[PDB]
Design a protein around this ligand. Structure first.
Ligand code: ADP
Ligand code: VO4
Length: 149
């Protein structure tokens, strides 16, 4: 089943929104398959956001993601990558739909609560980067028969 990488960013953690954010993912029918609260080391920060190295916000991004722990997650479900991005909302919280996580909880583009992989390819990339196979569980859930045909 399709898997994506989600990350509750340090703003959400420092605003005590971990449970709230997790709830929104669960109730959507997505399966939490891997999850750890962790401090992000510089190397991991920089390789995760390597595609932004030149940008204006880059230094501020590394600073921010390392400033306090994150909750890194692997989420499993049909179309999980797009489904997650759908309930997460647009990058800028003021363009994100009300009812989405960024729409409801985020104020600014720089502090926008959660990360989700943007494609199938970056999903597998980010998952390998943040997680080892032995930290990703695999289980059947009671509701599985009721989310899918
Ligand atoms: N103008 C900006 N200033 C500060 N941080 C930004 C800005 N734009 C994007 N970011 C950071 O990057 C994260 C994801 O958006 P971005 O990296 O631009 O695209 P993608 O979601 O494809 O990686 C945002 O949640 C935010 O933390
Ligand atoms: O931190 V993100 O690249 O899923 O907006």
């Amino acid at each position: 089943m399709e898997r994506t990488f989600l990350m509750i960013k340090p703003d959400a953690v420092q605003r005590n929104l971990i449970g709230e954010v997790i709830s929104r993912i669960e109730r959507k029918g997505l399966k939490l398959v891997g999850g750890k609260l962790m401090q992000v080391p510089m190397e991991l920060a920089e390789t995760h956001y390597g595609e932004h190295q030149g940008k204006p916000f880059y230094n501020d991004l590394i600073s921010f993601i390392t400033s306090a722990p994150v909750f890194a997650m692997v989420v499993e479900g049909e179309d999980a990558v797009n489904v997650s991005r759908h309930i997460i909302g647009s990058t800028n919280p003021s363009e994100a739909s009300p009812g989405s996580i960024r729409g409801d909880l985020g104020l600014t583009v720089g502090r926008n609560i959660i990360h989700g992989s943007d494609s199938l390819e970056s999903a597998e990339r980010e998952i390998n980067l943040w997680f080892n196979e032995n930290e990703i569980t695999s289980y059947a859930s009671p509701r599985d028969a009721w989310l899918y045909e």
